[PDB]
Design an enzyme around this catalytic site. Structure first.
Site, mmCIF file in Angstrom:
data_model
loop_
_atom_site.group_PDB
_atom_site.id
_atom_site.type_symbol
_atom_site.label_atom_id
_atom_site.label_comp_id
_atom_site.label_asym_id
_atom_site.label_seq_id
_atom_site.Cartn_x
_atom_site.Cartn_y
_atom_site.Cartn_z
ATOM 1 N N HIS A 80 -6.635 5.194 -0.279
ATOM 2 C CA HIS A 80 -5.317 4.842 -0.794
ATOM 3 C C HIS A 80 -4.937 3.391 -0.464
ATOM 4 C CE1 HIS A 80 -3.140 6.045 3.052
ATOM 5 N NE2 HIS A 80 -2.349 5.090 2.608
ATOM 6 N N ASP B 67 -9.741 10.821 1.336
ATOM 7 C CA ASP B 67 -9.071 9.530 1.463
ATOM 8 C C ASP B 67 -9.903 8.587 2.363
ATOM 9 O OD1 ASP B 67 -7.246 7.487 1.247
ATOM 10 O OD2 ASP B 67 -5.707 8.438 2.541
ATOM 11 N N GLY C 283 1.666 1.322 7.254
ATOM 12 C CA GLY C 283 0.996 0.107 7.684
ATOM 13 C C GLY C 283 -0.165 0.325 8.642
ATOM 14 N N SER D 250 -2.200 2.898 7.901
ATOM 15 C CA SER D 250 -3.145 3.585 7.020
ATOM 16 C C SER D 250 -4.461 2.854 6.979
ATOM 17 C CB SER D 250 -2.605 3.704 5.610
ATOM 18 O OG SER D 250 -1.559 4.626 5.557
ATOM 19 N N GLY D 251 -5.532 3.656 6.945
ATOM 20 C CA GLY D 251 -6.874 3.102 6.920
ATOM 21 C C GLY D 251 -7.485 2.848 8.282
#
Ligand SMILES: [Ca+2]
Length: 223
Positions: free
Chosen positions: A40, A84, A175, A177-178
């Site tokens: 995402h 994801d 922020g 994420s990942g």
């Protein structure tokens, strides 16, 4: 990260910032040429920033390397966030050192109750908004699949796990994420989603990296 602590500069040497003129997501360095992040977080024009602490100040240990290619998982579903995960290849290899280092992939899945380290430059407030300049960290346990499913009816797939604190107050956030979830020196999760941040009964949901090791290795071997 809400309810965490200041990691300390370059104490999380596999943490990357993905930058498109600004920080927008985290990632994890898994070898000199490849980063793992959340699907995402995909966009074109990514510069990977390694060796960061304060993302707004050049402090002396950074390596800025543009991405040459990104590969979203073949089965990523942006509606459900199933699968994801994405891989990002660097245009040139990073120079690995004590402050810029890969993190190992898992050889088996982690268990509920294992303590992990979650990190990022995301929002530090559960109501409201404040974005840090320096990297934040949170130690948190993996939660049971049954508690995870009960927290998020109809939403948790076999490619997700929950980690955090049902009482609230401590979580990843927008922020982050990942970015990484590391347990016993292995990358077990990727910051993926949750309802708000640090809310009671709404723990963080993370991509279950152990399910993807074969895809990661095969993809790197041919790209
Ligand atoms: Ca910096």
């Amino acid at each position: 990260i809400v309810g965490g602590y200041t990691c300390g500069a370059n104490t999380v040497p596999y943490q990357v910032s993905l930058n498109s003129g600004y920080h927008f997501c985290g990632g994890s360095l898994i070898n000199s040429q490849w980063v793992v992040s959340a699907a995402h977080c995909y966009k074109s024009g990514i510069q990977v920033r390694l060796g960061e602490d304060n993302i707004n100040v050049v402090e002396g240990n950074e390596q800025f390397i543009s991405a040459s290619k990104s590969i979203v998982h073949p089965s990523y579903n942006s509606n459900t966030l199933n699968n994801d995960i994405m891989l990002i290849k660097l245009k040139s290899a990073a120079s690995l050192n004590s402050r810029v280092a890969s993190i190992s992939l898992p050889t088996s899945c982690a268990s509920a109750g294992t303590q992990c380290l979650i990190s990022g430059w995301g929002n530090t407030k559960s109501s409201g908004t404040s974005y840090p300049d320096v990297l934040k960290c949170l130690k948190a346990p993996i939660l049971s699949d049954s508690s995870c499913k009960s927290a998020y009816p109809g939403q948790i797939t076999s490619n997700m796990f929950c980690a955090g604190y049902l009482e609230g107050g401590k979580d990843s956030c927008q922020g982050d994420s990942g970015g990484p979830v590391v347990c016993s020196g292995k990358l077990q999760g990727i910051v993926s989603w949750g309802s708000g941040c640090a809310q009671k009964n709404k723990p963080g949901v993370y991509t279950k990296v152990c399910n993807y090791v074969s895809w990661i290795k095969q993809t790197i071997a041919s790209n």
